[PDB]
Amino acid sequence: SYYKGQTALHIAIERRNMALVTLLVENGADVQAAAHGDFFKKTKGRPGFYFGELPLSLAACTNQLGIVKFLLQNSWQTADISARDSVGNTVLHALVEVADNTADNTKFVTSMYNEILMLGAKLHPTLKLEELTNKKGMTPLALAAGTGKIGVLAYILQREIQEPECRHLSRKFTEWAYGPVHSSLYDLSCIDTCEKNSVLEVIAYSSSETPNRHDMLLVEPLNRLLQDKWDRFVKRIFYFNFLVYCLYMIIFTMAAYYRPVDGLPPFKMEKTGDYFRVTGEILSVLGGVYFFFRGIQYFLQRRPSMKTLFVDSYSEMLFFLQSLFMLATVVLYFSHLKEYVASMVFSLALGWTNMLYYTRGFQQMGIYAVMIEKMILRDLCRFMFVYIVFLFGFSTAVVTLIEDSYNSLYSTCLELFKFTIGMGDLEFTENYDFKAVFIILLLAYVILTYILLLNMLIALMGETVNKIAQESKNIWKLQRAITILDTEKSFLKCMRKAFRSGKLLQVGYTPDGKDDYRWCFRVDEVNWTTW
Amino acid sequence: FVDSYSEMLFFLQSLFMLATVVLYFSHLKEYVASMVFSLALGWTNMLYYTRGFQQMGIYAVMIEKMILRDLCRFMFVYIVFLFGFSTAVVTLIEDSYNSLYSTCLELFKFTIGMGDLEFTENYDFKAVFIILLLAYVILTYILLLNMLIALMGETVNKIAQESKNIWKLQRAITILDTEKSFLKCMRKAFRSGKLLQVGYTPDGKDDYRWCFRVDEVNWTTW
Amino acid sequence: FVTSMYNEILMLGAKLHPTLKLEELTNKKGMTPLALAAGTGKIGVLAYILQREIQEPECRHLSRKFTEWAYGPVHSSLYDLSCIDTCEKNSVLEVIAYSSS
Amino acid sequence: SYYKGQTALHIAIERRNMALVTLLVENGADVQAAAHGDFFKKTKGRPGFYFGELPLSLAACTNQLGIVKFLLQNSWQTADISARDSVGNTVLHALVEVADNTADNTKFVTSMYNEILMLGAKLHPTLKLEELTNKKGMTPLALAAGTGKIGVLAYILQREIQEPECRHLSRKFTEWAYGPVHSSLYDLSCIDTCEKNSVLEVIAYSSSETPNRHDMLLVEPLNRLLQDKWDRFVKRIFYFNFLVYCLYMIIFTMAAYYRPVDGLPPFKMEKTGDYFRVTGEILSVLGGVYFFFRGIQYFLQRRPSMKTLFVDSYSEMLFFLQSLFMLATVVLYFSHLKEYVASMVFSLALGWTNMLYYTRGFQQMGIYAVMIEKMILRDLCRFMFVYIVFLFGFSTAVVTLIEDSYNSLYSTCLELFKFTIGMGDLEFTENYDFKAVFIILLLAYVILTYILLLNMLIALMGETVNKIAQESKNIWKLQRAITILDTEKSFLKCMRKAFRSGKLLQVGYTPDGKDDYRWCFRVDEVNWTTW
Ligand SMILES: CC(C)CCC[C@@H](C)[C@H]1CC[C@H]2[C@@H]3CC=C4C[C@@H](O)CC[C@]4(C)[C@H]3CC[C@]12C
Ligand SMILES: CC(C)CCC[C@@H](C)[C@H]1CC[C@H]2[C@@H]3CC=C4C[C@@H](O)CC[C@]4(C)[C@H]3CC[C@]12C
Ligand SMILES: CC(C)CCC[C@@H](C)[C@H]1CC[C@H]2[C@@H]3CC=C4C[C@@H](O)CC[C@]4(C)[C@H]3CC[C@]12C
Ligand SMILES: CC(C)c1nc2cc(O)ccc2c(=O)n1-c1ccc(C#N)cc1
Ligand SMILES: CC(C)c1nc2cc(O)ccc2c(=O)n1-c1ccc(C#N)cc1
Ligand SMILES: CC(C)c1nc2cc(O)ccc2c(=O)n1-c1ccc(C#N)cc1
């Protein structure tokens, strides 16, 4: 099973001998026979090499351009350019998975991808290779975006083939030109709108394990497509949602502020301010109900893996968690428990903290919020672990020294914490023996945490800012891109016609002769060189 | 003390623990004094296990560099100012902070953001008292403390790339220490690699070497 | 310079003294050249010795970095690993780790 | 007077024509005639060009190597290679002043300096050109160090001349050699010991206007000469002075600490602690007298310009000021005034701050102190100016708002200053009208000074650290070098024989044939290339 299905034709291509493969083809050796061996499969837990499980793909994946043309343009036995393995990966799919985003492999794969598309048009004019999907139902374009192959995704998106009768395989066209000025179109098909896997959908709705999902939106069609989606309709809908949440969170703030302080809720209706407060309290629960149902609407439609629900898209959880706090308030309010206030102030504090969601849509706010994110997961977490070891380590030493009031682990942890915030007493208690021991414990704690730990946290954040400053504009654009796609799905949901980016334009001719119309996106470039 | 101070600090805590037992059975109340230093050092010794975690270990390596490169330089100059101005202040104070300890503590509180600036009025020449405190504040708080943050940032910048190599060395010493202590009977179940035929002795005998496998992928040099 | 001069004097020793193993010889301090390079911090020659691959037949047994097999872009390379983690007196890992800073 | 003294021979060399100058020399035109024109002088307040006021130096300063050889190796009229202008600058002096430390000029001057030394040996074997001093009494070597010409100072110090019969003009010799190893000597004459102007003395005792005085000690002979002067004898004398000052400043601390608090000094003698305290008080005045006389000893021997006494050598000023405080203390003590306590606590604080002088002699302490000085002179002054503007403005506004107790400009300046140190009340007074005005004034002050000014001072120091980190090891070495030379002058002062660096060694032969002995400094270098 380790090499099951392997034929002598596989070894000839493996050894890189064009004469040896010719003899086997001449003798009738099977060319479509597939090596369904685990060594030839991915099998990430074991060493091996994946190439597409086909002799034809072996030549393509091993830079054997002649053997690819040999297996297709010969006379004895012509290989199938549309052949799919057990996984269903076409040779185009195999070329995508071989790519590993390094400099040399990208030039390799994007080249071999070109001619095998060029050859297929000459040999199978009516067949469209890229439209074929594997058993996973992913086209090579969708697989490159899914697996993070930015090197070949950039190639496919802005592909232009100069040679006639195969120009219709191109994706980046040209409407016209001038002296220094030329306007170039983009195919834009299966990019923003598609049946199953759009390029924008797969790049945005990734699991954060994708290598270059931030930079995959930087390729030329995607950045301008998302930016114009923002400017056309998404920006105003986002600003409307921002205003509604601000209005909702101010109504909730005033209803909580003017809550009655008498016992045993619910509270009876009196005067005129109670009807205004209950009015604002009804709208608060409605917003809590809306954010509760929008959360499960998010869980059912995207099915998070419980790993990409806390690291990414935690904003969805924190909005859902606030709704949970709001619904718990209503349960406790009608249960006559005073603990409804405890849940209501956590819903109030989290609800106002959730106002930081809308820092995307503003470039300087969004980049700032992306940097705030990086500190918590890179600097604050490391600081707090070491700080809590010191804080709990010295508090237990101090409270053991304290005798017969700070003789409590909580009262001592609070006094030592005040040192962090510039409010350290250093003489908060005198109820002990061994005053020298007490002073040495506090002075050691002060030097280790205040002078050393806190000042070094500032030094570490500056190092974090330096590295992430250039890249944080790409995380923000990804965060806004997810907002752009989420807005489209929620808003239109009836016709999907007013937000159509680009326009249907005649780009060329089908090789049969029919007119091909592609929803194309226009980009104008100016070059003062290459006249 | 420079390297393997973790062994010293773990041994020193044990010395504090054994001194506690000596004083506990000697009927001295000072066993508590030794026991809280054993408690505080024992919890500080919990930072030994920050190795074995990459981001914790690199963080702990950077913490170590500050103490031996930035904190030590700062404390020498700071203590000169602290003791230099405390003696000037406590000498001005008359007939209660008229103690070198009580004045060193008041001037230290300025460092931690708790400086009174009016803690005592028992002196003559109020202008002298204010000029001494304002000079101390500007020299240590505005200048010395803010410059320590500036120096740590320069230390972080230089050691950021290299600190992944000190951590791996620290974990490597832990890896070898674990091997020696754990097995210590057979040394068979933890051996790396495997005996594999690599070639032939020039005489003609088969040579078997415990070899470690590495797989590399190169898309150039076909 | 050194990693070259070290090479041929090993190649020549194989041709001239096939039965003799030069690297196994220890000085009065009881340290082999491999252990001495790790002890004294000679990373330039320690890197050479550890992944030494000699192409010459009849001299290939002096290599320390072998090759199990190969593929188109893929090749698996072995390493001698002898006197590295386990050794009688001075392992490379032991001497590098148990240094004096 | 603008071009007075200029001859036609000057114009021919100016125009760079070797044929034209030949005709004038053939016709008897004066070659030693000097153009004593202000346009040909330095005259930094007016445009011009200085070249040495001689036709021969014009060729040297204008890269006219042939004309230099023409004016010296011809038959009709030979120019004087030892000719000096009105300022007395020899052509070697002129070449030094032309150099401006740029990359191309250094190759220019250090070359032209070489061959004009070549010709002098061949044409005037008994004459020594470099030993000639101008009207200022400075040799070309001393002038290059004085004016900051590091490019040519490096050339002169480590000069090796390959030509036989010209090798005795070299300054960097070679004792022997090995395979990769070779030991090279250095002339070391007029470097550490000289009659008037040593290279070490002039570089160290500069006015801080010299361009590269920090880097002028980095040239190969000077760094190792000063480092070995440190290790031989200066280091232990410095550590002895550090210990004596520590002992003196602790005796002074204890005498001040245990001062009697009764009225009307001097105080009578009782018990046994008063004799111990007066003993410590006698030694305190003696140290004050010693630092007073050492200060004037510094003023008389070096004569500071009152500009290089505050920016550089402020350590001398601060020690002298502490001595002045001590003498004022004695005067007030014997005048029965209580203000001796004020003068003496100022003396105590300044004397303990003076303990930072001895941070030189320790590399890390010295670099740290140099960085502290850079902060004080670069960031702290700017911050204090802007901060004092803000503090005074808002304090005047607040104390004007305050009515009928913080109704004092001092009491309000102190309350607003406490905000800087993390002790700001924000509610220190309620004796006013217009509570909103009071809050807006304080909140504006807090945001402008605490959140903005203080946090940006930390940001500026980090930028200062980044730039000065590499160079601060060179300011420290200069500061230690001044300490090394100061120690030599003070310590030996009788024989100047035990600290002699290097040794008298036979380097070669005088061109006459006599043995030349130079106090030479040995440096051993290892090169594994150039076999
Ligand atoms: C009572 C409420 C308001 C407390 C304050 C809000 C808290 C819960 C919010 C505000 C900022 C949030 C964090 C922002 C960034 C990150 C990094 C991300 O990769 C994981 C989640 C994490 C770590 C978030 C966790 C929840 C968080 C800490
Ligand atoms: C009472 C106890 C807990 C005091 C706090 C723990 C002290 C003793 C520990 C915590 C961190 C430790 C330091 C960590 C880093 C270094 C750098 C190293 O090259 C020398 C030792 C030195 C300087 C350690 C000395 C001891 C140390 C300061
Ligand atoms: C008597 C009390 C106030 C003593 C306090 C110490 C004061 C006076 C000392 C300590 C540090 C010193 C400074 C250190 C560095 C510099 C930079 C230099 O280019 C000019 C002098 C200057 C600005 C010094 C001025 C005096 C100074 C501020
Ligand atoms: C950490 C930032 C400030 C943040 N904090 C939140 C807190 C919440 O309670 C809920 C949601 C958020 C939230 O979305 N962000 C966030 C993240 C990325 C971008 C970008 N680009 C914009 C905003
Ligand atoms: C300074 C750090 C935080 C530290 N502090 C300790 C304190 C003690 O009291 C005892 C031991 C330690 C200790 O080992 N480290 C340390 C050092 C290097 C690495 C790495 N890589 C991991 C941890
Ligand atoms: C600013 C530093 C801390 C300082 N402060 C002083 C304060 C005084 O009151 C008197 C003298 C000094 C003093 O010399 N330095 C200083 C300067 C340079 C070098 C170097 N290299 C070493 C020390």
A478, A222 Cβ separation under 8 angstroms? no
How was this model experimentally determined?
cryo-EM
- In whole angstroms, what is the distance from residue D122 CA to residue D164 CA? 11
Retrieve residue D367's tokens.
Answer: 């670099």
| The total number of residues written for chain A in this structure | 531
Q: Exposed/middle/buried for A75, CB within 10 Å: 0-12, 13-18, 19+? A: exposed
- In whole angstroms, what is the distance from residue D129 CA to residue B104 CA? 64
Long-range contacts of D115-118 (CB under 8 A, 24+ apart): D115/D65, D115/D68, D115/D69, D116/D60, D116/D68, D116/D81, D116/D91, D116/D92, D117/D161, D117/D166, D117/D169, D118/D161, D118/D163, D118/D166
The reply to whether ligand 3 has any atom less than 6 angstroms from the CB of D349 is yes
Ligand 6 centroid, distance to D454 Cα (angstroms): 24
Instruction: Determine if residue B52 is left, alpha or beta; phi over 0 gives left, psi from -120 to 50 gives alpha, anything else beta.
Output: left
DSSP-based three-state secondary structure for B16:
helix
Angle at A418 between CA A414 and CA A424, to 5 degrees: 120
Compute φ and ψ for A517, nearest 5 degrees.
Answer: -120, 120
- In whole angstroms, what is the distance from residue B96 CA to residue A167 CA? 94
- Tokens 């040593």 sit on residue: D198
Our separate counts of H helices and E strands in chain B read 8, 2
Q: Does an H or E element contain A348, and which?
A: helix A340-353
Query: In sequence order, which ranges of D65-102 are alpha helices (DSSP H)?
Result: 65-73, 91-98
Chain A neighbours (≥3 Cβ pairs under 8 A) are B, C, D
Residue type for position D122: K
Distance from CA of D375 to the nearest CA of B (A): 8
Angle at D261 between CA D256 and CA D266, to 5 degrees: 80
Q: Exposed/middle/buried for A96, CB within 10 Å: 0-12, 13-18, 19+? A: buried
Retrieve residue D399's tokens.
Answer: 């104390």
A453, A386 Cβ separation under 8 angstroms? yes
Neighbours of B75 (CB within 10 A): 15
Neighbours of D372 (CB within 10 A): 19
The distance from CA A34 to its chain's CA centroid, rounded to whole angstroms, is 36
Residues of chain C with C-beta less than 8 angstroms from the C-beta of B215: 74-77
Helix axes D103-123, D91-98, angle to 10 degrees: 170
DSSP-based three-state secondary structure for D380:
helix
* Bridge partner list, B93: B123
Q: Exposed/middle/buried for A24, CB within 10 Å: 0-12, 13-18, 19+? A: buried
- B17: which residues sit within 8 A by CB, 6+ positions away? B34, B35, B38
Q: What is the resolution of the experimental data for this entry, in Å?
A: 2.8
- Closest alpha carbon to D417 in A266, B134, C16, A403: B134
- DSSP 8-state code for residue A264: S
- D311: which residues sit within 8 A by CB, 6+ positions away? D208, D377
Residue nearest to atom 15 of ligand 4 (CA): A357
DSSP-based three-state secondary structure for B209:
strand
A433, B35 Cβ separation under 8 angstroms? no
- In whole angstroms, what is the distance from residue A138 CA to residue A132 CA? 8
A15 is in an annotated binding site: yes
Distance (Å) of CA A154 to CA A143, A160, A171, A496, D245? 13, 12, 11, 27, 72
D327, D296 Cβ separation under 8 angstroms? no
Ligand 3 centroid, distance to D288 Cα (angstroms): 19
Give 3-state DSSP helix, strand, coil % of chain D, rounded to 5. 60, 5, 35
D353 is in an annotated binding site: yes
- In whole angstroms, what is the distance from residue A33 CA to residue A19 CA? 20
Q: Which residue of C has its CA nearest to A12?
A: C72
Ligand 3 centroid, distance to D320 Cα (angstroms): 13
Q: Which atom of ligand 2 is nearest to the CA of B37?
A: 1
- In whole angstroms, what is the distance from residue B110 CA to residue B139 CA? 11
Task: Give one DSSP letter per residue of A43-75, joined into a string.
Answer: -TTS----S-SSHHHHHHHTT-HHHHHHHHH-S
- In whole angstroms, what is the distance from residue A21 CA to residue A9 CA? 6
CB contact under 8 A, B43 and A393: yes
Retrieve residue B106's tokens.
Answer: 């008041």
* Bridge partner list, B214: C77
A14, C71 Cβ separation under 8 angstroms? yes
Distance from CA of A453 to the nearest CA of B (A): 8
- Tokens 């001494």 sit on residue: B132
- Tokens 């206030």 sit on residue: A341
**Residue of B6, B59, B169 best suited for mutating to test ligand 5, as the one with most atoms within 8 Å of CB:** B6
Neighbours of D154 (CB within 10 A): 20
Q: Which atom of ligand 4 is nearest to the CA of A372?
A: 1
A448, A390 Cβ separation under 8 angstroms? yes
Do β-strands A181-186 and A174-177 pair in parallel, antiparallel, or remain unpaired?
antiparallel
- In whole angstroms, what is the distance from residue D391 CA to residue D386 CA? 9
Task: Give one DSSP letter per residue of A202-229, joined into a string.
Answer: HHHS--S-STTTTGGGGSHHHHHHHHHH
**Cis amide leading into A266 (omega within 30):** yes
The reply to whether ligand 4 has any atom less than 6 angstroms from the CB of A370 is yes
Distance (Å) of CA B37 to CA A329, B2, B43? 47, 21, 10
Retrieve residue B42's tokens.
Answer: 């024992």
| Residue A60 CA neighbour count, 13 Å, CB half | 33
DSSP-based three-state secondary structure for B200:
strand
Task: Give one DSSP letter per residue of A363-394, joined into a string.
Answer: HHHHHHHHHHHHHIIIIIHHHHHHHHHHHHHH
Angle at D117 between CA D112 and CA D120, to 5 degrees: 130
Residue type for position B178: T
Compute φ and ψ for B148, nearest 5 degrees.
Answer: -60, -40
Q: Does an H or E element contain B37, and which?
A: helix B31-44
Distance (Å) of CA A278 to CA A169, A273, A325? 63, 8, 18
- D83: which residues sit within 8 A by CB, 6+ positions away? D32, D54, D56, D90, D91
SS3 for A474-526 is HHHHHHHHHHHHHHHHHHCCCCCCCCCCCEEEEEEECCCCCEEEEEEEEEEEE
- Closest alpha carbon to B47 in B1, B3, B10, B2: B10
Q: Which atom of ligand 3 is nearest to the CA of D353?
A: 6
Q: Exposed/middle/buried for A26, CB within 10 Å: 0-12, 13-18, 19+? A: exposed
| The total number of residues written for chain D in this structure | 531
Task: Give one DSSP letter per residue of D202-225, joined into a string.
Answer: HHHS--S-STTTTGGGGSHHHHHH
Residues of chain B with C-beta less than 8 angstroms from the C-beta of A393: 39-40, 42-44, 46
DSSP-based three-state secondary structure for D186:
strand
Retrieve residue C12's tokens.
Answer: 């020549």
Q: Exposed/middle/buried for B188, CB within 10 Å: 0-12, 13-18, 19+? A: exposed
- In whole angstroms, what is the distance from residue D16 CA to residue D11 CA? 9
- In whole angstroms, what is the distance from residue D140 CA to residue D114 CA? 13
Q: Which residue of D has its CA nearest to A421?
A: D422
The alpha-carbon radius of gyration of chain D (Å, integer) is 32
Mutate one of B104, B152, B213, B214 to test the A interface: name it (highest A CB count within 10 A): B152
DSSP-based three-state secondary structure for C69:
strand
Neighbours of D139 (CB within 10 A): 25
Distance (Å) of CA A500 to CA A195, A196, A226, A241, C29? 15, 17, 12, 21, 80
DSSP-based three-state secondary structure for A304:
coil
Distance (Å) of CA B144 to CA B94, D369, D508? 29, 11, 56
Angle at A195 between CA A194 and CA A199, to 5 degrees: 35
Retrieve residue D211's tokens.
Answer: 């361009």
- Tokens 């004020």 sit on residue: D342
* Bridge partner list, D103: none
Retrieve residue A192's tokens.
Answer: 């923003």
